[PDB]
Amino acid sequence: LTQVSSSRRGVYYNDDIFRSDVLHLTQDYFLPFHSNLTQYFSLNIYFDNPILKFGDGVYFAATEKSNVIRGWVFGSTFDNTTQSAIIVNNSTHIIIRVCYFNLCKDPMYTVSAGTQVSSWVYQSAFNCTYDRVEKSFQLDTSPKTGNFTDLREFVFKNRDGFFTVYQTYTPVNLLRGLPSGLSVLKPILKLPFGINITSFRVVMAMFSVPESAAYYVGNLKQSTFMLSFNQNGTIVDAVDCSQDPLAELKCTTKSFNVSKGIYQTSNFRVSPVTEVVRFPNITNLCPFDKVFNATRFPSVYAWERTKISDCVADYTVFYNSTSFSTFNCYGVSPSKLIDLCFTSVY
Amino acid sequence: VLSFELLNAPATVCGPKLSTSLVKNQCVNFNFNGFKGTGVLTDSSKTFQSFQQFGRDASDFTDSVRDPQTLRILDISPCSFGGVSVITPGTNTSSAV
Amino acid sequence: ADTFLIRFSEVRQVAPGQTGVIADYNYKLPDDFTGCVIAWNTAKQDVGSYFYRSHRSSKLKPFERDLSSEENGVRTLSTYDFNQYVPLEYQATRVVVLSFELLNAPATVCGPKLSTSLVKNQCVNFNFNGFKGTGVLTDSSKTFQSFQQFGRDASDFTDSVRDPQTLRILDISPCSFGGVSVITPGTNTSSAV
Amino acid sequence: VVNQNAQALNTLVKQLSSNFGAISSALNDILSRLDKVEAEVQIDRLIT
Amino acid sequence: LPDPLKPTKRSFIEDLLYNKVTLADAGFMKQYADCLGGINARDLICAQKFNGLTVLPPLLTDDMIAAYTAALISGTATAGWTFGAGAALQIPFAMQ
Ligand SMILES: *[C@@H]1O[C@H](CO)[C@@H](O[C@@H]2O[C@H](CO)[C@@H](O)[C@H](O)[C@H]2NC(C)=O)[C@H](O)[C@H]1NC(C)=O
Ligand SMILES: *[C@@H]1O[C@H](CO)[C@@H](O[C@@H]2O[C@H](CO)[C@@H](O)[C@H](O)[C@H]2NC(C)=O)[C@H](O)[C@H]1NC(C)=O
Ligand SMILES: *[C@@H]1O[C@H](CO)[C@@H](O[C@@H]2O[C@H](CO)[C@@H](O)[C@H](O)[C@H]2NC(C)=O)[C@H](O)[C@H]1NC(C)=O
Ligand SMILES: *[C@@H]1O[C@H](CO)[C@@H](O)[C@H](O)[C@H]1NC(C)=O
Ligand SMILES: *[C@@H]1O[C@H](CO)[C@@H](O)[C@H](O)[C@H]1NC(C)=O
Numbered sequence: 001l002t003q004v005s006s007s008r009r010g011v012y013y014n015d016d017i018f019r020s021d022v023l024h025l026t027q028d029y030f031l032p033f034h035s036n037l038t039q040y041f042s043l044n045i046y047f048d049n050p051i052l053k054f055g056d057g058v059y060f061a062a063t064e065k066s067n068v069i070r071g072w073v074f075g076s077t078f079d080n081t082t083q084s085a086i087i088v089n090n091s092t093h094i095i096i097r098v099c100y101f102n103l104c105k106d107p108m109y110t111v112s113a114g115t116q117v118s119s120w121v122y123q124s125a126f127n128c129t130y131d132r133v134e135k136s137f138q139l140d141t142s143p144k145t146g147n148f149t150d151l152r153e154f155v156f157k158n159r160d161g162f163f164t165v166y167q168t169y170t171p172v173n174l175l176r177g178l179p180s181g182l183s184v185l186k187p188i189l190k191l192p193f194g195i196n197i198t199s200f201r202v203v204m205a206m207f208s209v210p211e212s213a214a215y216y217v218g219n220l221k222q223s224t225f226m227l228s229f230n231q232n233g234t235i236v237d238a239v240d241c242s243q244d245p246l247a248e249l250k251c252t253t254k255s256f257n258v259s260k261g262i263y264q265t266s267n268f269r270v271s272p273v274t275e276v277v278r279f280p281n282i283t284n285l286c287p288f289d290k291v292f293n294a295t296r297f298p299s300v301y302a303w304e305r306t307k308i309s310d311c312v313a314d315y316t317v318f319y320n321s322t323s324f325s326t327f328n329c330y331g332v333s334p335s336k337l338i339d340l341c342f343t344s345v346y
Numbered sequence: 347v348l349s350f351e352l353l354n355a356p357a358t359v360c361g362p363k364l365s366t367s368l369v370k371n372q373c374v375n376f377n378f379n380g381f382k383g384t385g386v387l388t389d390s391s392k393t394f395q396s397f398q399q400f401g402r403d404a405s406d407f408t409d410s411v412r413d414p415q416t417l418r419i420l421d422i423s424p425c426s427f428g429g430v431s432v433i434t435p436g437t438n439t440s441s442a443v
Numbered sequence: 444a445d446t447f448l449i450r451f452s453e454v455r456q457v458a459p460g461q462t463g464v465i466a467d468y469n470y471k472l473p474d475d476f477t478g479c480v481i482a483w484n485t486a487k488q489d490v491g492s493y494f495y496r497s498h499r500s501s502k503l504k505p506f507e508r509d510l511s512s513e514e515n516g517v518r519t520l521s522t523y524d525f526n527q528y529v530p531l532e533y534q535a536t537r538v539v540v541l542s543f544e545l546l547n548a549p550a551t552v553c554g555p556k557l558s559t560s561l562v563k564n565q566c567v568n569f570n571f572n573g574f575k576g577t578g579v580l581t582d583s584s585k586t587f588q589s590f591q592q593f594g595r596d597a598s599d600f601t602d603s604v605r606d607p608q609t610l611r612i613l614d615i616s617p618c619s620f621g622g623v624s625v626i627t628p629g630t631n632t633s634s635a636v
Numbered sequence: 637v638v639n640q641n642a643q644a645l646n647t648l649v650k651q652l653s654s655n656f657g658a659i660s661s662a663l664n665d666i667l668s669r670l671d672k673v674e675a676e677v678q679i680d681r682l683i684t
Numbered sequence: 685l686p687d688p689l690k691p692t693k694r695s696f697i698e699d700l701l702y703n704k705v706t707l708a709d710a711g712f713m714k715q716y717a718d719c720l721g722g723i724n725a726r727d728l729i730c731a732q733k734f735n736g737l738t739v740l741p742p743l744l745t746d747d748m749i750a751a752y753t754a755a756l757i758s759g760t761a762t763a764g765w766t767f768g769a770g771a772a773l774q775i776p777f778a779m780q
């Protein structure tokens with residue numbers, strides 16, 4: 001698994017609003033500049049498509065030769081108990097289904113050059129909650145080709161139950177590796193899915209073993225980006241302000257151009273990566289049954305007062321037993337008391 | 347009617363949470379009995395009382411805290427350190443700083 | 444049009460920033476929600492058995508759905524019986540949650556409103572798909588995209604808009620124009636300016 | 637001049653303890669108590 | 685004028701003018717090693733650095749300014765009033 005640098009690659013539209021002639025700064029998930037992606041081959045003299053890692057986003061760039069890369073299969077565990085969200089072309093249409101899939105170990109395809117077409121992506125589906133078929137493409141060139149012709153880049157983002165797809169497609173004359181330059185994407189799909197995605201694959205077309213293909217997988221990370229917009233509404237320049245002092249200077253000065261001098265810069269250098277949690281080791285369950293569900297509650301004019309100490313605070317035991325008519329908190333949020341520690345409770 | 351309170355005292359009622367390992371001299375985000383923050387942890391040497399959990403600065407910024415496990419004292423420092431200046435010629439001339 | 448069916452006492456949990464058995468393991472709304480929540484009681488026409496996830500290994504992301512009827516070795520699907528002759532905190536309640544967004548895109552769902560004639564080069568208060576404002580309207584020569592409706596200035600001020608009746612571009616300018624100075628002598632001397 | 641500059645910097649440092657109408661003068665006990673729905677109306681007071 | 689037989693590059697009166705303004709209270713010359721130690725973390729300078737309030741150093745140092753004053757005094761003594769107009773013209777001090 002050799003690693004190739006990604007020079008100024010993977011810039012998309014993180015916001016759906018329209019902006020023209022603006023140097024607006026975003027703070028979202030992006031592919032870091034000059035990052036090292038992994039290289040996956042498809043040579044004949046092999047066929048590998050392992051279960052990749054889908055974090056906060058994935059940059060997928062494939063240098064296909066003759067339609068070797070067909071589509072993708074998303075999901076969480078790729079089992080019988082979780083839903084997949086495949087986006088695969090049948091060589092004539094494009095089908096986007098979110099069902100309970102029964103995929104094989106290797107989801108290969110077959111081409112019409114060998115007089116055998118049979119889509120072997122999955123066995124059967126059931127309890128499908130989303131399906132749409134569109135035929136906005138022509139049949140792919142099933143006969144093969146002697147050199148690389150075009151490269152296609154894709155980015156998938158899952159957020160708030162919405163799955164957004166960004167794509168670009170450029171013709172080159174390549175032999176090995178990934179070119180250098182700035183590439184922007186555009187949204188084409190904003191589907192509602194409703195599932196959670198943590199791992200994804202790629203389906204490739206086999207011929208009975210493919211000739212030659214290569215794709216690269218990256219992972220988006222939290223970063224600060226400055227973007228430039230023209231009069232058309234497109235991105236013409238983008239700098240990642242976490243790699244060089246000049247990038248940080250350009251971010252601080254709010255301009256892509258600087259004069260000669262010495263300027264003080266802000267801090268976009270470090271970012272936390274791991275969390276530290278320290279709690280006292282108390283394992284006693286609180287008396288939530290002898291306080292709430294007592295035999296006789298007192299009358300209002302002679303209300304009692306009980307002290308709570310040396311406990312653990314678990315409201316979850318009330319989830320399958322009782323429903324509270326009203327429950328409102330003053331001073332603290334009713335959603336941040338799961339991880340709080342108190343000194344005295346009455 | 348429940349009425350909690352938060353002080354600079356040892357806690358008695360806490361939520362379910364699992365403690366992890368301690369990492370020092372790195373930019374991390376911590377959680378000490380529901381005191382969520384972000385900083386660099388360093389083994390300190392200041393002296394507290396028999397009950398004090400976290401000390402404070404003049405600007406009410408927590409800089410020293412006692413972890414509930416092993417009862418040691420840890421110092422909190424900002425991740426960014428000092429002022430950094432960049433000396434550059436013009437962009438049209440060069441791009442070396 | 445997210446639709447479901449819960450008990451009557453849990454309608455308070457369908458809100459931004461709440462906990463319980465609905466907003467933790469069943470259906471969670473995002474914090475920056477912009478919509479409407481509608482709920483009403485139908486305890487007569489909804490009789491049967493309906494399920495809900497009681498306990499889970501982790502919480503739910505906003506607008507996330509899981510149909511796992513059995514996780515690990517347990518079902519994690521408790522059931523309540525819906526009928527009449529039952530206390531009102533334990534009765535069925537239909538809930539419909541809507542969600543809006545107002546982007547620079549052509550409108551699809553609108554309200555009932557009758558369109559009037561177009562007046563140009565006058566100080567009028569306009570209305571373009573709910574965008575209420577005041578200004579002087581005139582024909583524009585600017586070029587737009589194929590989808591956008593209103594283009595903004597450098598100070599986030601809408602200066603151009605597209606009327607959905609006849610697809611064309613209009614320009615918006617303020618009614619007051621520039622600075623106007625008044626030269627006068629003292630009031631006790633005269634009143635001519 | 638030295639005393640005035642030192643006093644101005646010390647006052648600028650010590651002016652961080654005013655809560656400005658929020659529930660606390662620190663950003664850590666606001667973000668660890670209130671959810672993101674109603675914590676944005678307290679941070680903005682501190683920033684302004 | 686400065687003494688050539690001394691390790692200092694400043695004169696006697698210029699040395700007496702120093703050690704009269706106490707610059708240590710303002711913390712103009714402080715290292716970052718003692719602030720990060722934590723023993724003296726309650727200083728009034730380390731909080732300024734921790735809150736992003738730094739003090740930039742002056743461009744000209746004290747030795748350059750002392751050299752400037754020594755050059756001006758030597759030009760006044762040897763030349764007089766005529767080194768501010770054009771070239772320096774020598775003249776005995778009694779006649780000046
Ligand atoms: C997507 O949901 C699935 C199903 O809940 C998650 O898979 C497990 O999540 C738990 C949460 O505590 C982890 O402990 C397990 O290790 C996960 N894997 C398995 C195989 O059980 C998955 O993590 C979710 N993905 C994201 C990105 O949150
Ligand atoms: C509180 O405990 C009481 C018993 O002291 C519960 O009442 C009974 O609980 C049993 C549990 O096996 C049920 O079979 C009965 O139907 C319950 N009877 C009644 C009249 O409710 C009670 O459910 C508990 N909870 C509350 C909220 O009162
Ligand atoms: C509600 O949830 C509780 C908590 O899980 C269940 O109580 C468990 O019941 C099983 C089966 O009898 C016992 O083995 C566990 O020890 C119980 N756990 C605890 C924490 O008490 C309970 O059965 C569920 N159902 C009802 C109707 O109360
Ligand atoms: C390059 O790949 C290496 C692993 O070989 C990785 O540690 C590093 O972060 C990547 N990027 C750069 C810029 O070195
Ligand atoms: C997966 O589920 C299907 C449902 O049709 C079933 O036929 C199949 O046996 C299952 N496979 C397993 C459990 O490996």
Ligand SMILES: *[C@@H]1O[C@H](CO)[C@@H](O)[C@H](O)[C@H]1NC(C)=O
Nearest residue numbers: 090091092093095117119133
């Ligand atoms: C297109 O997909 C459909 C399923 O929607 C499948 O039956 C059909 O065979 C596909 N067409 C081709 C040419 O493979």
Ligand SMILES: *[C@@H]1O[C@H](CO)[C@@H](O)[C@H](O)[C@H]1NC(C)=O
Nearest residue numbers: 100125126127128129510512
């Ligand atoms: C969908 O799930 C329900 C609930 O388990 C089941 O009764 C039904 O048969 C499923 N549908 C299909 C097509 O298998």
Ligand SMILES: *[C@@H]1O[C@H](CO)[C@@H](O)[C@H](O)[C@H]1NC(C)=O
Nearest residue numbers: 230231232233234236586588
């Ligand atoms: C905007 O894009 C159009 C094509 O849609 C092109 O003709 C034009 O030159 C572009 N204008 C600018 C100012 O970039």
Ligand SMILES: *[C@@H]1O[C@H](CO)[C@@H](O)[C@H](O)[C@H]1NC(C)=O
Nearest residue numbers: 228237255256257258437438
């Ligand atoms: C820097 O300045 C030139 C000349 O004004 C300008 O045209 C150019 O866009 C700027 N360079 C960038 C943004 O790289």
Ligand SMILES: *[C@@H]1O[C@H](CO)[C@@H](O)[C@H](O)[C@H]1NC(C)=O
Nearest residue numbers: 280281282413414415416417
């Ligand atoms: C439990 O708490 C005690 C007392 O603070 C501490 O010494 C110990 O390390 C903690 N953990 C375990 C696993 O005993």
Ligand SMILES: *[C@@H]1O[C@H](CO)[C@@H](O)[C@H](O)[C@H]1NC(C)=O
Nearest residue numbers: 558605606607608609610611
């Ligand atoms: C209806 O809308 C169309 C399309 O914008 C427009 O041409 C037409 O004038 C409108 N009014 C009527 C009365 O048809």
